[PDB]
Design a binder for this molecule. Structure first.
Ligand SMILES: Nc1ncnc2c1ncn2[C@@H]1O[C@H](COP(=O)(O)OP(=O)(O)O)[C@@H](O)[C@H]1O
Ligand SMILES: Nc1ncnc2c1ncn2[C@@H]1O[C@H](COP(=O)(O)OP(=O)(O)O)[C@@H](O)[C@H]1O
Ligand SMILES: [Mg+2]
Ligand SMILES: [Mg+2]
Lengths: 245, 245
């Protein structure tokens, strides 16, 4: 039974936050009760949703109620990141299951954990608290190694911290349609990882890059753009995999 | 073991020929030996590939060799339709398994049967000779009924003519990205038919409409266009389903 899904990988700039935000947008639209949790001190998901918070995840880990920390956004709830969050890293280091205990998210159908571009204690807290992992990757050649490494990390976390942890899927993001290289990398990703790679692929599209600067999801910003259609179908695909898991 | 795949549905103009041609283009590129068989008297696949034939399927059914009837096209082989083909309809009516016997296609890995926009004896011959069926549909509201009817036809052919017959998949084609209606119809198609609907969806795109008028596949005509990327991924998805079947 997959409820909590971590968005994670080694690198930054690979589409974790974009996928977190827009999956939430379309899963809410599918009639699910969704909580988006921003675990990045840089607070990109919080910012990309137009929200300025004084209280967030930091304050959840200290004991303050979930209900009075969340912000209603585009038909879902955001548990924001605040500029304080950085000061939990040292405590969470040595306490990988802290988020798992602090998350009393019984009311929500699906919980999206937007992890930072590290394997920091916050990323590890994400992995330890989740049942599913979506791994965004560019259709670029380094992705095969990056993926294999992440998969080995997942295996290690499953063996030592969280036996519920499973790869939901590898998601190809920022697929550049102007070039044949993306085709070739996608084909190799599928050749090597098979059914683990989602069939839905997220196009590189200006409207997706634009959306966070406006503090809006792609469903609010550009609902008929190539990225909107893709994330809507991805939400359907994610639900199919959750249902079959 | 799925080798022969029919492209079929009730209506015309829904993307059977386009899918036949472009699947062949990308399956050949995947290293498969592909035969495309044009079963439409109007010969749209033959024309869309730039080929003018005097001899084709009509002459295959009379007994003339397969090797001397096929035309090399874009890394695959086309068994063309000729303006005579119409004169087999009456003989094939009452002989649904005629194509099944006449196809001595042992050498080919995959065989694509492009059926006419009917349930003519030629379409029935296609169904009787195939192991898999791809059903192209527009993301438009009539599709749900059209699909259900085709599925009932498939069930009947499986029960009476061809126990090997199975739906490979329902393919959403000519998905118009300018509108939210296509999203809604896709979602309903998935709600109702589930895993039977391919995840890869073919965008409505000018370059795809253009290609047959040039007698070229989308891989020849516009290799980085939205339709090219989609058909390449569809070929991968079709192979996945063939392998898991
Ligand atoms: N499909 C896409 N097309 C175009 N730009 C994208 C796409 N996905 C992400 N971006 C942009 O790339 C930058 C990094 O994306 P982000 O999702 O924050 O990556 P991560 O969270 O993994 O570091 C952001 O400015 C984002 O808007
Ligand atoms: N994805 C698409 N985008 C734009 N035009 C398309 C697309 N698919 C098919 N067409 C066009 O629609 C017309 C009918 O398509 P076709 O594949 O011949 O349908 P069918 O064989 O089912 O009758 C053709 O002119 C074709 O080029
Ligand atoms: Mg991020
Ligand atoms: Mg046709």
């Amino acid at each position: 039974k997959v409820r909590r899904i971590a968005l994670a990988n080694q690198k930054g700039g690979v589409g974790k936050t974009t996928t977190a935000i827009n999956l939430a947008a379309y899963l809410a639209r599918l009639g699910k009760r969704v909580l988006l949790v921003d675990l990045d001190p840089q607070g990109n998901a919080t910012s990309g949703l137009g929200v300025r918070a004084e209280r967030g995840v930091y304050h959840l880990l200290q004991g303050e109620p979930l209900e009075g920390l969340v912000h209603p956004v585009d038909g879902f709830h955001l548990l924001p990141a605040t500029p304080d969050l950085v000061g939990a890293t040292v405590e969470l280091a040595g306490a990988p299951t802290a988020l798992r205990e602090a998350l009393r998210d019984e009311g929500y159908d699906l919980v999206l954990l937007d992890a930072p571009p590290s394997l920091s204690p916050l990323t590890l807290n994400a992995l330890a608290a989740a049942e599913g992992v979506v791994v965004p990757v560019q259709a670029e050649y380094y992705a095969l190694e990056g993926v294999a490494g992440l998969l080995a990390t997942l295996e290690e976390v499953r063996a030592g911290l969280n036996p519920r942890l499973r790869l939901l899927g590898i998601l190809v993001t920022m697929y550049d349609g102007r070039t044949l290289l993306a085709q070739q990398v996608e084909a190799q990703l599928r050749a090597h990882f098979g059914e683990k790679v989602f069939w839905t692929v997220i196009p590189r599209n200006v409207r997706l890059a634009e959306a966070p600067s406006f503090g809006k999801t792609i469903a609010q910003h550009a609902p008929t753009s190539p990225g909107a259609h893709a994330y809507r179908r991805l939400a359907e695909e994610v639900m199919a995999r959750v249902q079959e898991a």
